[PDB]
Each structure stands twice: as structure tokens, then as C-alpha cells.
Design a protein around this nucleic acid. Structure first.
Lengths: 95, 174, 242
RNA sequence: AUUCCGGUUGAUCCUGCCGGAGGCCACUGCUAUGGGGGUCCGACUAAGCCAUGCGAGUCAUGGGGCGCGCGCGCGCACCGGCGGACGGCUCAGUAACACGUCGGUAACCUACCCUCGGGAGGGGGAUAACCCCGGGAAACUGGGGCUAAUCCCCCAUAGGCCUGAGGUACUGGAAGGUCCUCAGGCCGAAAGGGGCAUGCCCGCCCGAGGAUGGGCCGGCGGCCGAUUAGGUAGUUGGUGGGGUAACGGCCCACCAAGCCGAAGAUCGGUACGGGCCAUGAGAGUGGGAGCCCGGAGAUGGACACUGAGACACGGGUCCAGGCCCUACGGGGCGCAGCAGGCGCGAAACCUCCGCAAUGCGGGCAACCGCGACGGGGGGACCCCCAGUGCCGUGGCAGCCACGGCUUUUCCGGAGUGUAAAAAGCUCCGGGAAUAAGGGCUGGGCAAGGCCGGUGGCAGCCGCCGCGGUAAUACCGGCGGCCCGAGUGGUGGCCGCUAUUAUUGGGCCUAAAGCGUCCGUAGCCGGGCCCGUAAGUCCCUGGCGAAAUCCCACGGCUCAACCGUGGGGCUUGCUGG
């Protein structure tokens, strides 16, 4: 699987970076969240903590999926803003 | 009052047992490998709508009228039924065979990717045909003028290998 | 049979001046009473969430508003139902952003970006005048606000002039009168969002409102109501308009 | 597609009605693989009756206490405040300013919100919670002691209202209006509270305006009946008053006799109104349950308290009509809220998950709650896209055997998706496997002049008409045509129908000219000149919500669907 960042925004109020990216996987299934997160952080120099992946979305016939991610500075602001369900889904907190 | 329901996008014949119409539609269905009568009537209704818009816009005064005129002609050019130097009066000469020629099944046949319309339908439904960058599984997609030169076999597909048995048998004819 | 006031608003019954998807959900935010009318305003929640895109959910928008980050006319506003209207300034210092609220040629409200210097002035159209006890003069403005002046300078103000003010402290500057060569911007009607110079005024009998003729910036003339003409200058606009 | 065909005679041309052929809605027979989208599913008969569970709370930054852990932190009830008058459901009643559109209120009220100008001084009191006794089958409820507040009261000042005499500063098209001066009187505020801190945040009262939501008035528009012709008696107006938030016979005392009506009053019948919907080439005909705006109602009827707002859908009082518990003393309930049950019927779903999204209430906030809303479950609701195989050799007249290919769909698995699941989407393995019926077959009208059975019997038949021993018309088999996951039957609307005729029908003999004449209203009216500009035409301003309808572009694979923009619709009103 390969990754290609399409757009980045900075939200100075909530204190986050909002990343829109594409994921090319030709002949393979939809990649997991662990691999996408590892690659994202390894590339963009982000803390593995303070980074949550929203939807990974596949399409009818594409072999190209889309992705949205949020990168926070502090972890307290993160836990204050984001809801608990995406945190449990990503694995940064327990149910 | 009453709210709006969704209405059919096709019309039926006024009488169901006329010999001329029966023969014509039988020939067309056989030659183009159409599942049922409902498809034919869909394309005929498309054509009838085009013709009605032409008749209404013909010799009518208004900026909106000329706007609609240009929009109609450009939409037809883009669909691939008329050329760039065409006039409103050229719409009243179109037939349903044109719409039947502009669909993905017929085009996959003409382009030599299949030997028969039935084989083309099967390929399209099983997912061995890709438009410029997208797999499509509807044999009546009505390919546009800017996509007819980007139709081929899907990347992951047995037919994408030069040395496939059925691909060899298909190429036999060409 | 309804026995009291309304507290809900459905999306299909929302005003046309908004930029809102009507068939997506069933409910909309019902604006609270405030400065401007319902047909000429929009709540802050929509500006923060759907216009600028600083949030995706109303919870986030409300956190942003309650943290004290959005200013209107130079004042912190925390109510997500507070209505924002024509000639209002929306400012964000943590991003140095400044917007003026104006209408389109369709009648819908947009944000026009402006500079930090012009973001300190707001024009107010005088809608009415009153005498208040102590013999003071009260001007009633277009956003619903009021201003006091003295009896000695009452002839220097009339019911269609414009007053420019420093907005947080509300001190007056640069009165602009209604005359036959004044520059105006139209706010409502069929000729909304047009601009030009006044040519003629016409009066009528028994309640029918007065009318005004305007010349476009290229030679074309049109008419509208004198209540929909907002004076912004004498021969050259005094704010950045689109 | 601005369409026709069959049927009155021994044969013909007309008139005229019946039927066929199309679309939409409801019920139903037989049959049924998949996905997506949407404003569908006890409206038609009973606005009939209901077991059980839920559908409205929240505030510790208003107050006092009690319990649990090291003055501090957690939990419970009470006092207090805001809300509970919205949201949700139904279509009984209503032929009316109820609705729609244009206008008015200089004749009115408005807690929560915005702006400006001003204030917060001095005193007092009670009582829940708690302790000591309890009563009662329950429902409920008594006595004594003690206490606080943003609870209650008093004084003051500001302020509100009425009247009279003056001045003429403001708005407007126009002052019983606002402002200034003087006088005589009635009513009469406030929580300087809570929190942080060494001033800031949330709050309290008064005044001027706005906004939001309402109340009231007017012009115009909108079903059938004459075997319904005269109706009205506070009825129509005036003077003076009362009452109302406010104008008003709204109500009262007095003075008059007026008001509506053949251009159809009154009375009766039926009915929630509109945006819109179905159909048709259109002119037009019909309907107006589901989504939005408005109105009305909460077993039938009437009457009140509290509150900014109710004569109150999950608050109160009485009568009528039903039901439930009882220790027989007394007490309680009405699903036209979500599920669910009985009954009525031809005729309509689970006694499921969640506050993650949209919103509302409360709260400084964090957040809590919500059968609204969202998500799934069941259903031949509506629309869109597909499937039940394809290729080659040979053969027969579309199907057979031989060989090969594919996997939408089916079986199983990993990810993503989701509040959590599920569906869907990417990928892997298996395998032509796993998936067509309904009606018709004499002529309208498309397809058999084949076999057998029955024999005016049995049966068929929209209509014409078949059947009495050789049945192309009944029953079965074999063939064939139409549509096709759908296809037939019964009721209703439009069209067919120029059989309601403005466009656009007829009256010598087919239905149809009053027995004849006079004339009232109404309709139709000779030629020229001058004026006006009411109708009429052109141009421009303010209105006729959104959704729905047409077109183009864009996003879900395309589409149905959703978004951006341009036109239309709103049968029209009004200023120049």
C-alpha cells in the first residue's frame, strides 16, 4: 500500500492539523488502521500518540481509498475535544 | 394537497398488439441483445424528450430560449449524437438506433473486445471492462464522446493477459 | 391549537437568505431575538461551522464560542443563537481574520474579507428620532441600537443619514447625509447589492413610501425604496465592498 | 400518435348508446434471486375500548441539613429558580375574515434576547428538610419543637397612571402620540446576591426603543340545491356610559326604524383550507391522508386557579356515560404519544438499540435528559440498476452431445465500515454451480383450421356470440403469441367522448322552437367631431415562503438521489 497526501489544514483554535490523503492498494484489500498510522507518522514526523484516524473509505471499483486524520499537539486537548468512540476505535484508550 | 411520488422514466405503447411495431421491436431486440421491451422504451423516451425540447425551443423569443438552445446542442455533442457544427433542425432527424449505438454493450462489441453482444454483456456484468479509470457494470451507461477512446480490459482481469485462451479466440476474428 | 410561542424551526421553513442544506436533516437552529430581523440575519453557529469550516459539529462550535474566541462588533459573543447581520464585522485574532457581512445579487449573506484597520468602523443608518426626558435626542438605528445626542445639535441628524462609529466604544465619526450626489449601496429588493449615486427622490400620499432613483457606475439608471438605500459616501465609498 | 375498432338490416347510408384498447389509486388470486434511493405501511368502517413498559427535565457558582471517605472531596432527599403553553397525534366539528393574497393598528400585550441611560438604602418574619409522637387497608395526612436563602412582607426614594391649564422642541403623509412648565391626586421597585481573586465572571430593579411571538380590522378570491322565497327584533344606526391589553351592540340606559334579498337572501346538504396531486396534445375534468404553512380537538358538555403566555394532550372542579382496587369506611382511570392488545371490518408492522449526528429545555461551563430524531427488524409501497450463463465443433429444426471460459449472484473467510452491530465496499478460496412464472390462443386483438374427451348437458361470454355426435370458441395434452420478477381479477378517477360542445355539438322528418303576441331586468346596438382616461397596451418599483416542476454543471460506479445557478409556478394584488 502507498500513501499520497492531498491536502493539509491548520486549525489554530482547536489546535490541530487536519490531513486529507489517498491510499493506493492495487490487488490488495483495504489496509488496516495500524499500518496507515505507522506510515503516516513515520513520514510526516507526527507523534504516534496525539494522532487519530477518522474514516478510511473504499469505493466501488477504485483500488484507491481516501482518508482523514487529525493530529493534535497536546494529549489533554485531544481527550477534551475528541469523543471517546474514535479513541477506542483507534486504540489509544480502553472501553 | 398531496406530495409527489417518483414516476417512471419510460412509456408504453398505446396498443399492445400491432404487427408493424411488434416486428420492428422484435428485430431491434434480437439485433442488440436487449433483455426485455422496457429498455427500448427507455431509449425511445430519451429521444422523444430531446425532440420535444427542440420543437418547443424552435423559433421562440428570449435570452433563456437561446440559452436552452445552446445547452441542448452542447449536451448532444457531448453525448456523441451530433457534431460541433449542428443546428436545431438536425435533432428531428435522430433515431433510436443512435442511442442504441451509444451504449457500452454495443461499443464493446464494435471495438472488437468481444465477439457477440451477449459475451459483451457478460464481460460488463462480471467486471472485466474499465472505462478510463473506473469499472462499470451497467450495459446501458451511454458512453460519452470523451471516453470512447479509453475503454479496455480491467487491470485485474484474466482477459488482460495477451495469452488468455478466450482472448485469443476473441482476437481470431479481427 | 398553539397556546404559546414557538421554540423550533424546520429546515424547509428557514429563510432564503441562508446557505443551508434543506433536505439533509429536519431541524434548524431557531435564532434568538436580537439586533437584526430574522430575514436579514443568520446565527453564529452556521458562520463557524458551515461557512468558514473551523468545526464539523455543534459541540465543537459551542466549545469554540464559549472559550471566548469570536468577536462581533468588537464584543465577545458566546451564544450560538446570536444573529449576525448586514454591515457586521466578524473578527478572529488567533488568525488575524476580519470579515464584513453583506448580501449577494441574489439576497444571500456572504463574508467579505477586510483589513484590521477598517475592521474598527461600522456604519449605522438612522431609522428614527425621538425626544427623551431631560430634553435629549435619541437616534434609533438600523441594527436596533440607540444613541444619545444633545438638543443643540439635533438638526445635524435626520432619519436616513449614516453615522460611522468606532464599534467597541461607540464614538461617532464622519456623518454622511442623504443628498442628490451621494453614494449608496442597496440592501433589499430586486436590485440588491447594487451601488450608485442618487439622482431624484419622489414622495407619495397616504402612507405609500418614498422612492429613489440611482445611477449605476456605468450609466444605467434604476429605482428602489429610500429605506433600502444605505449611504456609504459622498462621491467615493468609505468601506471595502465587493 | 392532436388515432380508432366491434355491435340495429335480406343488403346500404345516418343518428345514437354499450363495449374494447391507455394511465393512476385501493383490495385481492398465482408466483418470486440481488442491491441502492425515497416525503410509504389502522386515513376509508369504530373521534370505538384498553393490560403492561416507557414518551420532561435540569441547576451544588441559590440555601440549610444528613450520610460516606481523608476543613476538604463524593452521594441522597427537601426548600428555591427556570421549563413543562414547544415538540408529538388525529381530522370529529366548521360554508366562516376559517383559509389565501394585498394592506392597516395614530385602537393593543409580549418572560427568554440586543442597545443606550439610570439605580441596589433601612428593617423584620414565617416554614419545609431535621427531632419527639403518630392516624389510616389504601389513597393520603394531624400535633409539638428548630431553622436558612436569589422565599415572604414593611419604610424610603426613583418610577407608573388619571385629570386640568399653558409652551410648541420630535417623528410622520397626517398627532387623542412623544418633550418642556405648573397644579390636584391614586398605585408604588430592586437579590449589591453568588463565584474567583488582590478588580473580573454570572446575576437583580426602573425607563426609551427594537427584535420574536401573538391579538384585532379591512379590500379582493374561492362547492351543490327553488319539490328551499321572503328573512332579521340587540335586529340596523345614533347620544351617553361600562368593560377590555385594545376599536367595537362586546354589554347596558335612552332616541329612531332601519339591515339582507331573483345579480338568490334565509334554510338545508356535503366538507378541515392552501401550497400541491392524477389525467389529458391542449382547452379542461376530477382529488386534495402521508412533506410544509395555517385552523380545530384531546370520552361528551360546562367552569376556574397559577403563570409573560392556558381556560391546559401525560394539572384542577361539577354533570352524563363507561371501567378498576376495597379491610365496604373510601378511593382511582379514559393511547386521536411510541410499542402492543380487543372489537369493526375487504382493508394496514417489533410490547427492538442509542442520545454518536440535527435540534429543544436546563446549566457560567463541563454536561444531563428527550418513543422528537437517528439506527436496524417485518411488508409484492414507489423509483433506479442488474441476474437466472458465455464461446467453439457437429447435428436437427431454438434446442441436443463434446470441449473450454467466467463468477454479478450463491457458500465460507480477513479488513474497512458502524454509537455498537448489520448491510454495503476492497481482497482470498470453491464451483455452471444456486435462481421463471402469469395470462391468452373464433373476431375486435398478436398467436393451432393438430390429438383425445363431453355432447343445448356440463360449461364459456366486458361486447359480438360458441355448444343440439365430426366443437379451430367447453375440459385436458402437445405446440405457439404477450409481458416478464412480475403477471391476472373487482371497485374508483381521467381519457376514449365534438355523448356537456368558450375553443367545439344539435332542434322539417332521427331527442329537441313555448299556441300567438306586448313588454321589465339583463345581453347586443348606425355614422362624424371635441374632451376624459375607467376598461385596454408598454415601461418601470414593492409582493406572491420553502419543497414540488424544466434545463445545464458537479458528488455518491452511472442512475434514481443530493448540491450550485438560470427559468418557471403561485390563476393574482398594489405604487408611479
Amino acid at each position: 500500500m502507498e500513501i499520497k497526501v492531498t491536502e493539509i489544514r491548520e486549525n489554530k483554535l482547536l489546535g490541530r492539523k487536519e490531513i486529507y490523503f489517498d491510499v493506493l492498494h492495487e490487488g490488495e484489500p483495504t489496509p488496516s488502521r495500524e499500518a496507515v498510522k505507522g506510515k503516516l507518522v513515520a513520514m510526516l514526523d507526527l507523534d504516534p500518540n496525539t494522532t487519530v484516524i477518522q474514516y478510511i473509505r473504499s469505493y466501488f471499483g477504485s483500488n484507491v481509498s481516501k482518508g482523514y486524520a487529525k493530529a493534535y499537539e497536546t494529549r489533554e486537548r485531544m481527550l477534551y475535544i475528541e469523543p471517546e468512540y474514535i479513541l477506542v476505535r483507534d486504540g489509544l484508550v480502553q472501553k | 394537497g398531496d406530495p409527489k411520488r417518483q414516476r417512471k422514466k419510460y412509456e408504453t405503447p398505446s396498443h399492445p398488439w400491432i404487427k408493424e411495431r411488434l416486428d420492428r421491436e422484435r428485430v431491434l431486440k434480437r439485433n442488440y441483445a436487449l433483455k426485455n421491451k422496457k429498455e427500448l422504451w427507455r431509449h425511445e423516451t430519451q429521444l422523444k424528450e430531446f425532440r420535444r425540447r427542440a420543437r418547443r425551443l424552435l423559433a421562440a423569443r428570449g435570452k433563456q430560449a437561446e440559452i436552452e438552445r445552446q445547452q441542448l446542442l452542447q449536451r448532444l455533442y457531448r453525448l456523441g449524437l451530433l457534431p460541433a457544427d449542428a443546428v436545431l433542425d438536425d435533432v428531428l432527424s435522430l433515431t433510436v438506433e443512435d442511442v442504441l449505438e451509444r451504449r457500452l454493450q454495443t461499443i464493446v462489441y464494435r471495438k472488437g473486445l468481444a465477439r457477440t453482444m451477449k459475451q459483451a454483456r457478460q464481460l460488463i456484468v462480471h467486471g472485466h471492462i474499465e472505462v478510463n479509470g473506473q469499472v462499470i457494470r451497467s450495459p446501458g451507461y451511454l458512453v460519452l464522446r470523451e471516453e470512447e477512446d479509453t475503454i479496455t480490459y480491467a487491470k485485474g482481469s484474466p482477459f488482460a493477459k495477451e495469452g488468455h485462451p478466450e482472448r485469443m479466440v476473441i482476437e481470431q476474428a479481427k | 391549537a398553539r397556546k404559546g410561542p414557538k421554540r423550533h424551526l424546520k429546515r424547509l421553513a428557514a429563510p432564503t437568505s441562508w446557505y443551508i442544506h434543506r433536505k439533509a436533516y429536519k431541524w434548524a437552529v431557531r435564532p434568538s431575538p436580537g439586533p437584526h430581523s430574522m430575514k436579514t440575519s443568520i446565527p453564529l453557529i452556521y458562520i463557524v461551522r458551515d461557512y468558514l469550516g473551523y468545526a464539523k459539529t455543534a459541540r465543537e462550535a459551542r466549545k469554540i464560542l464559549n472559550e471566548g474566541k469570536i468577536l462581533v462588533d468588537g464584543r465577545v459573543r458566546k451564544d450560538y443563537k446570536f444573529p449576525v447581520g448586514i454591515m457586521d464585522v466578524v473578527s478572529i485574532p488567533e488568525t488575524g481574520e476580519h470579515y464584513r457581512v453583506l448580501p449577494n445579487r441574489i439576497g444571500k449573506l456572504i463574508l467579505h474579507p477586510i483589513s484590521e484597520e477598517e475592521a474598527k468602523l461600522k456604519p449605522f443608518r438612522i431609522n428614527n428620532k425621538r425626544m427623551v426626558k431631560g430634553a435629549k435626542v435619541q437616534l434609533n438605528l438600523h441594527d436596533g441600537s440607540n444613541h444619545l445626542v444633545s438638543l443643540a445639535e439635533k438638526d445635524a441628524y435626520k432619519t436616513s443619514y449614516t453615522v460611522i462609529m468606532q464599534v467597541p466604544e461607540r464614538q461617532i465619526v464622519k456623518v454622511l447625509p442623504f443628498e442628490v450626489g451621494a453614494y449608496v449601496f442597496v440592501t433589499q429588493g430586486k436590485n440588491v447589492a447594487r451601488k450608485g449615486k442618487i439622482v431624484e427622490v419622489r414622495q407619495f400620499p397616504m402612507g405609500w413610501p418614498d422612492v429613489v432613483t440611482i445611477e449605476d457606475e456605468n450609466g444605467e439608471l434604476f429605482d428602489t425604496l429610500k429605506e433600502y438605500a444605505f449611504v456609504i459616501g459622498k462621491d467615493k465609498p468609505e468601506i471595502s465592498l465587493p
